[model samples]
Target: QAARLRRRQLIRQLLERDKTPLAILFMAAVVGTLVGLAAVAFDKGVAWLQNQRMGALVHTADNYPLLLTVAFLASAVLAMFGYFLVRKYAPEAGGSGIPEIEGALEDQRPVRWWRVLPVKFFGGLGTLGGGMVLGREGPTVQIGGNIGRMVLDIFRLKGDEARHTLLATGAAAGLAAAFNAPLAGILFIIEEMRPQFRYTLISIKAVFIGVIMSTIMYCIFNHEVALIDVGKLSDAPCNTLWLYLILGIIFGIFGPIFNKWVLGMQDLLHRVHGGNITKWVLMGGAIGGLCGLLGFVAPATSGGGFNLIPIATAGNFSMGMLVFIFVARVITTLLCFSSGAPGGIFAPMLALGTVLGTAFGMVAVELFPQYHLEAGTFAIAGMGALLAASIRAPLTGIILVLEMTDNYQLILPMIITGLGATLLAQFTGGKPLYSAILARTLAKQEAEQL
Candidate 1:
């Protein structure tokens, strides 16, 4: 009886030892599932809100004055709700949440999930629903990482294994939820967060579980369609690939300049408002009002720019108008985003890439008519080039655009564009936008502590 008891006790100890990894994987799955659901709901919710507003406006179009006033007022109120929610509850939820996650991973910042979860989820809905130019992916990622921290706290889990695994799991799940591309989501964690993400057998498995769960949740809620669905483009010829390289080079130069402008604008706005809550709110309302006005005039120049991508790629606009919209959207993107509104710049950047790429493609086709190229192919390739250049994550950019557009055939051109963009951006001494933002946050924290 004593020997049998000893054997059973030893078996139980072994099982307990193995359970940690299993627990991590389970928690990762939970994070993925929750993040995916949140992401899908966020996307659908914004669409529903926008549709409701549009439906109302359509019914009352005969009352132009009332419609215009209502439109701007509605957007202003919604945007104020978003800005106030973030500022009042969770300031860390502002802008892209990825940098905050990165800071949390390094223990440089705290993850107040209790505050962030609700603030970002609801605030994002309000801001995005207000027809502001933002993307769901960034907030999804931040929320996912926070969920990871939440799981850790709930499970009373301690140690690097628990912390690292859960954080990575959350980030992967977030990307998966955003794009519904499990492979790309996993790759995003591996590639984009390489500096902070820890690699291990168990941890990788945890990430995989998270991504799979998120994908499942997304499909259950939003169906399995790729986000943009521009369809596959024909492969670019080797001779014509040089055009993509040139396109990337153009973005490489502009990408750094754009990042600089964004930071400079943020600094300028900070000085302008001096961190006064009323001023911030008023500025955000003004920006939202302007966006509402632009929506009435040239809807393409407003919103997140997702719908405009296909139109631009289809060559629906003249070259001059394309340039005009590109420049115009850049200004709006900078103004709205740098104001510390509860929104993201991802979709706007993608839109910018599409317009600039189309422009490059048109010019290239004219210059080398013998190449017999389709400009849309370059548009597809260029979709992620600016992201690569600006973020310095070629793999993430490549996979993201591929997943969004389902344009695997343009992989070669995408690679060329991304690689060129990365190289040139680095050469031009450009830093990743999120990293820069986080650095600024840390600098402020340090100054405050001092």
Candidate 2:
């Protein structure tokens, strides 16, 4: 009877310590459902724009001059429209927009959802639709986070705790909806946003609930399917696992360099524009025009690279061709992604990883004719390694790639590859890409204040 009494008091103590109200949990679900719908709308909208733009090129395919003119002008106008919107209305909508969310989470930035949502949505459509090398995930995440703020305002939710929980909930929901990877989405908040996310039991559960609802809403619209279908790859035997380590190390070395180049490129564009919105829009137009023409000549090298992944991994190109595509894409990705365009670098980085991985795998195959190796496994491992190296989030990278590819069998090698990349990446003393970007933005904000 004494032990039972003790147990009852313990249970009561636990309930008293649990500060999250049922109201906040319900709010999280609402945020998730709304973010899911927003994601589907964004996806369909981008696709529709691409199809329409592509239709124009198809119709004028026989006429070289007409095709070039049509592609250039069409893309230029679309991109200009996006740049103008971002610059004139919400300057925060430019770039990956992930940094903005990180800054907001850290209380270093404010959520200007009123301007950000419309500007990011329409600006993202214009830029992404213009065929620039950008991903939709970043915009979706920012949008998702803003929606959380918007919901808070609508419900008049008071207190910083409620605000923080809902903001994180929305961000996770956005990621889950974007990739259709619920687990990765949750891990992303716990792992990637570790520095800024308030770790409460209730907040964690809120993230879980948000991801679940967002994923379900996504499934309702698009049906449940792996984001990338690389097909079932042969197992990586113990003997062949070293190759994965090599790939990770390669990404580790490249990751810091890539981040440097990205920041440098941003500086170059900033100088070129000189904070002049006109120059920015015109520059964006030129980049968009180039991407549009490249889309015609080398479609695989342009855009977000989602469609390019399967083709690259399918052995459709030789080693030389794969290397060429990788190099060309790195250049184009730098040009478009770093040009202050309203887009994300996530998809571009993934594409870059797959190409490099496939190339490395092919080389491995040549070196080890006795192993009967599969390049696709390396491709999958590489898919996560770059993200792990650059973002410094191995769990998110591993779980994301695993969920997207549905390749649970390669978990061991994936973990090894991710660890290797992150180890060497950290050894190089480079900060995570998003954090670095946020730091720069905060510095600028301080400068403006002073």
Candidate 3:
């Protein structure tokens, strides 16, 4: 009886006391560190792969035939491999993983971390390496959330609130890890996932702590530098701010159309593939090879578009060239993303926005020389405007741009553009990007179950 009482007392000490603060901080830090490392690995991996394929052409520059063929084949091989992994394992990892994690938070979707982690890491390496215009943020965010669940399972934690908090924390950390932008990461949870993410005291604190930890870890390896470095430019004047509102409205109009085009193309790809794994992967390969060819043909029109931002903002391209590149990229973004080629449309959209916004800025320069405006200001504004319009998260878009470009002086212009863009998109009944994707994914699952 005395020994039995001792065992019972041990159980009370172990499980009876409620603990959330220390373990919570420790877990958050753990997940954040992993998220940062994984993101760093993924980013470097994609860049290395890109260099491998594209670098071949630069060396064999004289042998045009050999260079083109090598570029085409290498990219095709990489793209096909990525598509195969996605099809063979986790189909949900094919697009921007932001939707999947958001769905997981609501328990509307399952988190197949076992399949997704490996598939996304290597698959993203292949596709983004194949010169496809995708963002590292998507895969990183997905990886972060999956790791959160993985950690939870390892620790054998039990409790609905704990599960929710960890998932949200990981996701937020994942985002910040990719860009080294903790504020955007934190704001993303509070803004983009506001309705879906639980707002318990623990959950909020976990997100806050998670982003800080992840950003800290990410910066240790990588130097603190702007991801997209457009040189310092003048801020939008108060009078000129009205022009930004107009620009925002312009984006608002484009925002709805952008969603419609993406949605229609998504449906089109579904019909084309009809769930045929072989055809889907092959189609992705074909798209990749073609993009490879395009990358060689007009260096500015292809790739992820980070390199294009500063160039586009520098007024190097003529008005006609800007329009041409803008139109070209829209087609490219739609085709690549719509094909479900394991890429992201976020970076592509920002590139597109810079192109078009610069065009507008150029026109503004022509019309109102009184402002004596530098077109780069609008390029910056346009960059985040698309985010607001497409994702319907003005705060996240604003903070992300502020973090990415390091031009906080343009905060007013960025906010104005974001608010305007989202206002028009929402006003006209356009849906948020990830929510729509998640809804479609859930709908598909329901249909399959039936």
Candidate 4:
């Protein structure tokens, strides 16, 4: 009885002094597990729907007219359903979800997970499955962050710090699960969320735990492989390293221009919506259907970029065709992301970067045959450059690309290109993508609240 009383007294003291952090830690584990499962289910749902949508043409491969119509309608309806879900249920769920998570971390935005989780998952199913030029990271990131909030609320956990820490942790977990990139996920939170001041060691530990859970879940249900299957390529020598710097500068220019176009389209859509949800969603559907139609008309440009990367980098298309695809994909990316679709721009941008980078590599190889340069090396470098310039998160860009490619030699080029991209983008007045988007979101929220 004396020992039991002492232990009980110790437990009471511990709860009184350490319960908040302990509670947050416990909840973080739960959040990670849940986010992992959510990711599997959501991804599988999207795949199934996409396969169903595309299967319509399986029987009529040669009947071009019939196949085209079926493809258009099937993808169109799937996309419309996604747009409708966001329009009616969760207006906040639209677009790449990263900025919203960033906003939530800063307490500038509300997390309506009850609305967001379902909207992002199913809406992503529609948008992604419908062959829109978008990816899963944004939705998954947003889903994970919202899941964090949902857990906090569900267990009646409160206070600003706990909310902030777990919200960031959940987002990190979702990001890791999206591509099974745990390092990138953690870096994403540290670099993107900028939680240095507030996130405790305990909080960081929670995030670490969350990522492990989500990643394990992802691996259990998915094939274990590098996200991109680009075979090992020859390393670039210092003699040809200047070319990578050039690529970075070019993306520095491209990044700002892309941002301008994306922002401009958002403003245009803002005017298009004019406070009407129906118009916003139906217009979104039209854009989604057009992306689907492009699959038949411009097979080079539709769907996610992963399917295009290997082909683009393998010297399949000539320089001229590569440029065309790059340009075409830029237009598609602008349409889908700028239209506020529930998907991501990151995966889609890889193809364009690969196409253009391959073109650059091809030209370089022809001009400098003595160097025995691998254009694919430049392709790999260029892809990282685009991400760094656009996102202004060079570490994440380099590490994430390195994770995908499994090439250690690519690291120096990635760092150089990412550095150049970020430098030139800043010199040209390009803001980081997430911060810019968050600014837009806050302005919109304030405007509506008024």
Candidate 5:
């Protein structure tokens, strides 16, 4: 009887303790640190692989055809590996994993961390490494969220607070890992994941801790260099600010149209292939081959537009070529993403914004040569407009570009541009990109259940 009473007392003490939240926060820090290190390693690993391959080919210009063929084939095979992994293991791993987290937050979806973590990490390495026009942000965010879930499960934590806190922490860490921007990561959670992220003191602190740890990890692996190094451009004059507004409006109209086309193309591809694995794989290969060819002939039109931003902003390209590349990229971006390849559209959209903004800035320069307007200023504004328009998260868009470029002086212009884009996009009935993706996922799951 005495022993039984003591056991009951111990159980009562355990039940009375409020340690779960702190435990969850500690787990979040661990997840952030690990995810950050992994992200940095992934970036370096891909660069090393590419450099090694090119180095080997550099000494053999006489064997150009052989080298080009091998390069294209290697990229295609790597992409194929990514696609196969996603389709076979975790279909949720496709596209940006942001929507998945949102769905999970609402309890409308399962975490399935066991499958997603591996699939997103290695599968992302494959597709991203294969030179697909994708960004690491999406995969990192998803991976981070999955890590949160994994921690919760491992600790056997049960409650809404634990679930939501960890999820947000993971996402914040993911963004920090992607760009080494701690504040932006925190803001991303507050803005982009607002619906799901609880804004309590404890919860917010958890996110802060996660982002801090992730940033530290990133800095440890890769020395601090702004992601995009476009030397500081001239600030926009108040007189010239109207042009940015105009550019924002243009993106507003194009943004919704682009989103609609993306979904429509995905639906079209699905219907045409009828979910047949061979057909899907073959279609992906065809798209990959086309991109490979484009890379050889018109390199700017093919890959994820990070490299193109600096070139376009340098004011070297004519307005005509900028427009041409913009149009070409639209097609390529849609084709690469819609073909069900294992990549995210974030980087491609940034490239698109740069092209369009450069065109606008060039036109402005010609019209008012006396103003001495710098084309690069428009490039800065455009950097985040498309993101604002498509994602419907103005703060996230603004902060992301600011962090990426370290252009703190452009904050006002960036906000104006992003706000304009969001306002116009909403007026034009544009839906958030991730929300749409999630809806599709839900619809498909419902159909399968039936």
Candidate 6:
């Protein structure tokens, strides 16, 4: 009896002495696991829908007119559902949704998890299934952030620290699951969300713990595999490294232009739709139909761009073809993303960078035939350079590309290229894309309030 009482006393003392609350850590793990499962579900759902859509098209391949009609109808119907859902149910679920999370972190926006979760899941399903030039990362991150808020409310957690930590943890965990990169997930919080993330001993530890659990769940479902597989290429020679810098500067110049294009496209679409639900949904359908038509005619320019990355890095296309697809995809990316579709720009941007880089590498090959350079190396470097330029997170871009592609040998080139892109992008007055979106959103919110 005396020993039992002493044991109970020791447990009480241990709990009291603990500086960090165990509750927050436990909740973080829960958020990670849920976000992982949600991300996997979202990924699988998009694939299943795409396969079904493609399966129908393949079956009707014998009749060209019939095939084209079916493609347009299929994508149009799917996109209509997505746009209508967002317009009717949750307007905040319309775009990438990253800005909403950032607003939430700053207490400038409310976390209406109840509405956002379902709207994003189903809406993303429709838009992505329609074969738009969009990415899954943003949706996954938004879903993860909402899941964090839902968990906090369910557990009745108190304190702003817990709120902020859990939300950041969920966002990180979602990114980890989306790309299967645990370290990059943590770095995203540290670098991409640096402005709002409250870094503390407990908070950072919570993010790490959350990411670990998320990665574990992802591996359990999908197994450990690189998201973008560009077979091992030769390392960059010291002499050839300067070329990577030049390549980065080119992207740096283009990066700001691309951001401006995106904003401009958004304004154009808003003007076209004019806050009318019918017009908005109709425009989305029209865009979706255009993408569907292009899916057959120029398959390279549609979808999230993940499948195209490897093909580009593998040198499957000529310089002319590469440039054509890059320009076409740039147009399509701007249209689909800026149309307020519930998708991401990251993967599509990466694909554009790869295509452009491969083209540049081809030019280098002709200019200096003696060097015998591999364009794939430049392709890898270019993938990260865009992220550095547009996202303004050079370290995260370097680490994310390294982790996602498992191309560690190109680290030096990746770093150099990322630095060049970021430096020039900043000097050219290019703001980080997400921050720009968030700022625009806040201004609109203020105007609305006034």
Local distance difference test, each candidate = 0.81, 0.85, 0.83, 0.82, 0.78, 0.85
Which pairs clash (backbone N, Cα, C closer than 3 Å) in model 2? none
Q: Which whole-number lDDT from 0 to 100 does residue 292 have in model 6?
A: 80
Candidate 3, 1-450: lDDT as tens digits: 599999989999799554566676688888888888888788778878877876788899999898889888888899899999999999989988888888888777788889999998899888888887777777888888898888889997777767777787888988898777899888887778655545433367777777888887776775544668777888667889998899999999899889888889999887877989899988888888887778888877778888888887756899888988988888888888877777777778888888878888898988999998888888888898898898888888788878888888888988898899999998988988888888888888889894
Which sections of candidate 1 miss by over 4 Å? 1-20, 196-202, 223-226
**Model 5 lDDT per residue over 1-450, tens place:** 599999999999799764546776787788788778767876786566556545645665688788687667766766777777778888888778888887887677788888988888787776676666677777888888888888788788777777887887888888788866788789877777757444432378778888888888876677644667788778766776677788888888888999998898888888867888767766666666566556665878886778788898856788778988998999988887776675678768888888887788888788889888877788888888888898777787788788777777777778888888998999999998988888888998899994
List, residue by residue over 67-171, the lDDT tens digit for candidate 4: 888878777788888888888899888889988888777667889998999899999989998889988887899999999999988798867777877888789
Rank all candidate structures by their lDDT, best first, as comma-separated numbers: 2, 6, 3, 4, 1, 5
Off by over 4 Å in 4: 1-20, 195-202, 223-226
Clashes of 3: 0
Candidate 5 local accuracy as lDDT? 0.78
Error of 1 at 396 (Å): 0.7
The TM-score that candidate 5 achieves is: 0.90
Error of 1 at 410 (Å): 1.3
Q: Candidates sorted by TM-score, descending order?
A: 2, 6, 3, 1, 4, 5
Q: Candidate 5 at residue 245, lDDT?
A: 84
Model 6: colliding residue pairs: none
Clashing pairs in 3: none
* Candidate 2's TM-score: 0.94
In terms of lDDT, which candidate is stronger, 3 or 5? 3
- Can you give the lDDT of residue 364 in candidate 6? 87
Compute the lDDT of residue 235 as modeled in candidate 6: 77
Name the lDDT of candidate 4.
0.82
Worst 10 residues of 4 by lDDT: 194-203
Winner of 2 and 3 under lDDT:
2
Candidate no. 4 TM-score: 0.92
